[PDB]
Design a protein around this ligand. Structure first.
Ligand code: ZN
Lengths: 96, 217, 25, 115, 87, 97, 206, 129
RNA sequence: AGGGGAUCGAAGAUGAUCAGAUACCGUCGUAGUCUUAACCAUAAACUAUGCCGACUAGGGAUCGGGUGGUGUUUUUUUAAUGACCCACUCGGCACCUUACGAGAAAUCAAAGUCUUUGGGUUCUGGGGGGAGUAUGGUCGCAAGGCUGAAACUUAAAGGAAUUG
């Protein structure tokens, strides 16, 4: 039983099932598709440099309530205009 | 100033029975807890967990506490109690009493050739309590216990030194994790072994031997 | 909404999409 | 309703259990009996107890109660149980065919008959 | 379960069932020990003498305790021709 | 879950069975379903039997009957109280009271 | 091993056959096929009285050898077994539980009915199935006057008698009492019969 | 259809011993079944098996004695080398001292201790304890 | 496409209720409902339970077949026959009790013989939405079928049972 094959010669079938279900996996699909290059805001790199275009105070989500004080920046190497939250208190007073 | 209430209690108070070895041996029912109060001095406890359960009533919200507490001396006997009570203190107290009622023997073994007072389990063992399968693998000397903190403290109370502990299912529920480990430690003597293959003369029930110290007053 | 009526909605939407895509040569 | 409670009912069953021959069938006599032979803190509650006692006494004289028994009832039941008639020949044993085959294969004498 | 110097360990030895020879647990509160009488000549079952049997909870619950008792009693001579080996 | 092991009403090996129509609401309910009852009445109920016998020719001839087989949807069955919602443990009972 | 004085004794065989104990029920319950001897036509099954008496003497040898012979407990919930158990109890120790059982009477050490026996005897296992279960919980043998279509679960030694006649039930109780007394008891000379009549262990109308 | 007569024999035996039977009628038989039972018998896990010889394939009646916890088959019959015998033992036997892995070597059907001694290996068959 | 078109009846028309009522209720009625010749190819197409094989637990019914009975009723004198009864048997659709086991539980003699994991084999699933969507393919007269993503967003969604 157990639904899979168990014959001594079914390595091909086992291998191919594994290869077909790794796509139903999540993180493996992203790795092989290569979203970190073809689509992601960064080029898959760990950091990225930008030019501060504008400063957006955006309201948080419920049930909280606050302004979050981020900056709408544009990446230098790609050209995707993203939004970067700013860390601890006043750092928006620091970023022009 | 405890007084015995049952036949077995009469015997253990009259000191004619002095070993839970013999109690388990004859699979006698431990109805009082004072008997092992006598029969396992130095028996230390450990309150594994306290958690609130709630019932949703007409107007209010009836909260009571379920306390899970393990007990053991340190050498080959453990018991586990669960209790539900309106207050945490009474909960722990009655949990200790129920644990002492449910003390159970564990069979320690070797991971290889026998040398100096078995350290580990006798065989791989498994216990399942509602979707939590705790499995215990023997281990060589000096490997210690490798398990979750709760099962590790429980097996440490049991006295097994070296155990490999697989696990499966939603272990996050400590009640069921400890219940599973308890069924595993029971299945320890559950298993039959080429050592135990031999024959015995089937001992003769201290109830039946001392029946006269066992009648009423 | 009910899965059956949602299916019928997406059916009519698919029909309209096909129609405009066919009008677009 | 006039549905008397466990206090009076248990008290009445017990007093009839331990004072059956002294108790009587009259309400006033039973009442005074309770007065002298009970420590009860109300004339009203005593009257309720005594009334249920007379009622139970009537149904006890008419028949047995499922609830309570006395020394007298215990004695008469002892003897009624001890009665024994002559045990269960009419000649040979009764109708038996395959059980007769049983007794032949088992090896008895057993004067019996056919069926 | 002895140790290096041939010395015994394993704090106690369990009693094994007499129907299937399976270990009778400590928590098997269904496990039962029948003690029949050794009868000397002319009735008068001498007190203090037991032909001991140990029946397990599994056998008793599955309901073959009477079968196993009949077989064991005949095997130890307690009965004469109540249990047949070939059903 | 599965409120009933017989899946509501008994098929167990057909696959399809022709449906009948309820008698109150006329709803096409399968025939294995459709609470079925037998109405065996007299035409001339004892509210009027003696009247008829008093006023009738053919002395003591007979009294005929009306036989009807009623099929009921489950909705109208419960509504007209031919059947009632039972306890979870007495659902398994099949015998007719 | 049991000496040749302990055979069926055609007199007791007459008693059994006259009380009509050899009759069973129409359903066999294969766990009792050994005890069945033959199938009577017109749908009746004939219990083997030989095995009946042998199992009775075995059960008597079990009911003896209890050092404090009162700690035997004898249960009966039928009507046809109540006077039987009362008289059996009166003779041996055998604390009787007649009528209803008040369950939790072997566990629950604080009840007033809390017996803690080392053996039980049940007249009808199907209707005393609560006492059977309690004995299961607290580790106790069973000696039961079972019928053929009687549940053999959690029952130790069984005596197939009738469970459908007054005479069968009472007379099996009577013979068991006699045999347990004769095992040591005080009834010397097994070859001499017993004075007490089975009418004692019969239930009047009343 | 019947694919692994040995697997079915061992499964019948396991079921009978779990039920608490004393003997079991296996069908059909085979040389590998006879040899497997012989290994078991040598180590003490079963009693006596009587091979009823009808003309077709034979049947076996195996009088047990308890003391056999679980017998099973490993299918397919993987090729175990002498270095991987240990991995198999450690993966499907309870403790390092009892219980036997049963290989099918070119020296006959044997246990894993006999296998380590004669220093041969081959197709794994099953296991007993 | 052709025939036939009684009944019921999508659409539609109208009457009432309603705050409204493009609906429920009421009268009418088109396609349809039926058949022949061709298409489609999906359904809660359900036993939400793949097919083959082996073993494990009792019980009573019942359908088809088969064996046995110095059994019951039947012709006209009792054989044959038929049907019924009893015991068993093979294959079925199911059913009653237990939990021996399994399960998260509801519950299951198969959803058992699974941590003491391996009888053979096919297909499918990998948190919820977007989504059975877009697109490309292929089949179809068409409706549509099969195949089938992503960008993005989210900490839940869900199953079984308990107390309200
Ligand atoms: Zn209806």
């Amino acid at each position: 039983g157990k639904g899979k094959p168990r014959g001594l010669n079914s390595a091909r079938k086992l291998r191919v099932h594994r290869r077909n279900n790794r796509w139903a996996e999540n993180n493996y699909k992203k790795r092989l598709l290569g979203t970190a290059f073809k689509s992601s805001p960064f080029g898959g790199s760990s950091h990225a440099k930008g030019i501060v275009l504008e400063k957006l105070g955006i309201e948080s989500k419920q049930p909280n309530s606050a302004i979050r004080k981020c900056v709408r920046v544009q990446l230098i190497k790609n050209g995707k205009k993203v939004t970067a939250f700013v860390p601890n208190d006043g750092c928006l007073n620091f970023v022009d | 100033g405890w007084v015995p209430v049952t036949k077995l209690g009469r015997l253990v108070k009259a000191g004619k029975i002095t070993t839970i070895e013999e109690i388990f041996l004859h699979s006698l029912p431990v109805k009082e807890f004072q008997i092992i109060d006598t029969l396992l001095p130095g028996l230390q406890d450990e309150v594994m967990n306290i958690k609130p359960v709630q019932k949703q009533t007409r107007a209010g919200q009836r909260t009571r506490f379920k306390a899970v507490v393990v007990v053991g001396d340190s050498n080959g006997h453990v018991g586990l109690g669960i209790k539900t009570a309106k207050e945490v203190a009474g909960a722990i107290r009655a949990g200790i009493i129920i644990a002492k009622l449910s003390v159970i023997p564990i069979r320690r073994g070797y991971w290889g050739t026998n040398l100096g007072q078995p350290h580990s389990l006798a065989t791989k063992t498994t216990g399942k309590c509602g979707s939590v399968t705790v499995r215990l693998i023997p281990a060589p000397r000096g490997s210690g216990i490798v398990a979750s903190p709760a099962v590790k403290k429980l097996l440490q109370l049991a006295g097994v030194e070296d155990v490999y502990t697989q696990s499966n299912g939603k272990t996050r529920t400590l009640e069921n994790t400890l219940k599973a480990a308890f069924v595993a430690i029971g299945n320890t003597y559950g298993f039959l072994t080429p050592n135990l293959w031999a024959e015995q003369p089937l001992p003769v029930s201290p109830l039946d031997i001392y029946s006269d110290e066992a009648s009423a007053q | 909404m009910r899965a059956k009526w949602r299916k019928k909605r997406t059916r009519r939407l698919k029909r309209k999409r096909r129609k405009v895509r066919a009008r677009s040569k | 309703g006039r549905v008397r409670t466990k206090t009076v009912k248990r008290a009445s069953k017990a007093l009839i259990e331990r004072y059956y021959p002294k108790l009587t069938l009259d309400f006033q006599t039973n009442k005074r009996l309770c007065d002298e032979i009970a420590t009860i803190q109300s004339k009203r509650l005593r009257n309720k107890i005594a009334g249920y006692t007379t009622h139970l006494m009537k149904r006890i004289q008419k028949g047995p109660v499922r609830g309570i028994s006395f020394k007298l009832q215990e004695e008469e039941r002892e003897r009624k149980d001890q009665y024994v008639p002559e045990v269960s020949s009419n000649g040979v044993l009764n109708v038996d065919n395959q059980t007769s085959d049983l007794v032949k294969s088992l090896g008895l004498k057993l004067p019996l008959s056919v069926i | 379960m002895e140790n290096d110097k041939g010395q015994l360990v394993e704090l106690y030895v369990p009693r094994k069932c007499s129907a299937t020879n399976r270990i009778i647990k400590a928590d098997d509160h269904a496990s039962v020990q029948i003690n029949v009488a050794k009868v000397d000549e002319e009735g008068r079952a001498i007190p203090g003498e037991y032909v001991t049997y140990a029946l397990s909870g599994y056998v008793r619950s599955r309901g073959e305790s009477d079968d196993s008792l009949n077989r064991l009693a005949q095997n130890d001579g307690l009965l004469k021709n109540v249990w047949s080996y070939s059903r | 879950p599965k409120k009933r092991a017989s899946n509501g009403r008994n098929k167990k090996g057909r696959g399809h069975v022709k449906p009948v129509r309820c008698v109150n609401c006329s709803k096409s309910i399968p025939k294995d379903k459709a609470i079925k009852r037998m109405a065996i009445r007299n035409i001339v109920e004892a509210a009027a039997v003696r009247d008829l016998s008093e006023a009738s020719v053919y002395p003591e001839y007979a009294l005929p009957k009306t036989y009807n087989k009623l099929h009921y949807c489950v909705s109208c069955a419960i509504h007209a109280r031919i059947v009632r919602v039972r306890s979870r443990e007495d659902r398994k009972n099949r015998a007719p009271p | 091993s049991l000496p040749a004085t302990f055979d069926l004794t055609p007199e007791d065989a007459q008693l059994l056959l006259a009380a009509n104990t050899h009759l069973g029920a129409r359903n066999v319950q294969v766990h009792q096929e050994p005890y069945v001897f033959n199938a009577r036509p017109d749908g009746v099954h004939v219990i083997n009285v030989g095995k009946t008496w042998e199992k009775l003497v075995l059960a008597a040898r079990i009911i003896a050898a209890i050092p404090n012979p009162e700690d035997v407990v004898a249960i009966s919930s039928r009507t046809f077994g109540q006077r039987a158990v009362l008289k059996f109890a009166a003779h041996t120790g055998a604390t009787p539980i007649a009528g209803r059982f008040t369950p939790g009477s072997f566990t629950n050490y604080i009840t007033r009915s809390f017996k803690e026996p080392r053996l039980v005897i049940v007249t009808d296992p199907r209707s005393d199935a609560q006492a059977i279960k309690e004995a299961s919980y607290v580790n106790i043998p069973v000696i039961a006057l079972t019928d053929l279509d009687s549940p053999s679960e959690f029952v130790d030694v069984a005596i197939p008698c009738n469970n459908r006649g007054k005479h069968s039930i009472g007379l099996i109780w009577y013979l068991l009492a006699r045999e347990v007394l004769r095992l040591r008891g005080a009834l010397v000379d097994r070859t001499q019969p017993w004075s007490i009549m089975p009418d004692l262990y019969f239930y009047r109308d009343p | 259809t019947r694919s692994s007569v040995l697997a079915d024999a061992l499964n019948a035996i396991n079921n009978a011993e779990k039920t608490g039977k004393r003997q079991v009628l296996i069908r059909p038989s085979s040389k590998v079944i006879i040899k497997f039972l012989q290994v078991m018998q040598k180590h003490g896990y079963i009693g006596e098996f009587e091979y009823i010889d009808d003309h077709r394939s034979g049947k076996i009646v195996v009088q047990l004695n308890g003391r056999l916890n679980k017998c099973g088959v490993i299918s397919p019959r993987f090729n175990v080398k002498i270095g991987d015998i240990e991995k198999w033992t450690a993966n499907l036997l309870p403790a390092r001292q009892f219980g036997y892995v049963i290989l099918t070597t070119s020296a006959g059907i044997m246990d894993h201790e006999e296998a380590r001694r004669k220093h041969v290996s081959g197709k794994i068959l099953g296991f007993v304890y």
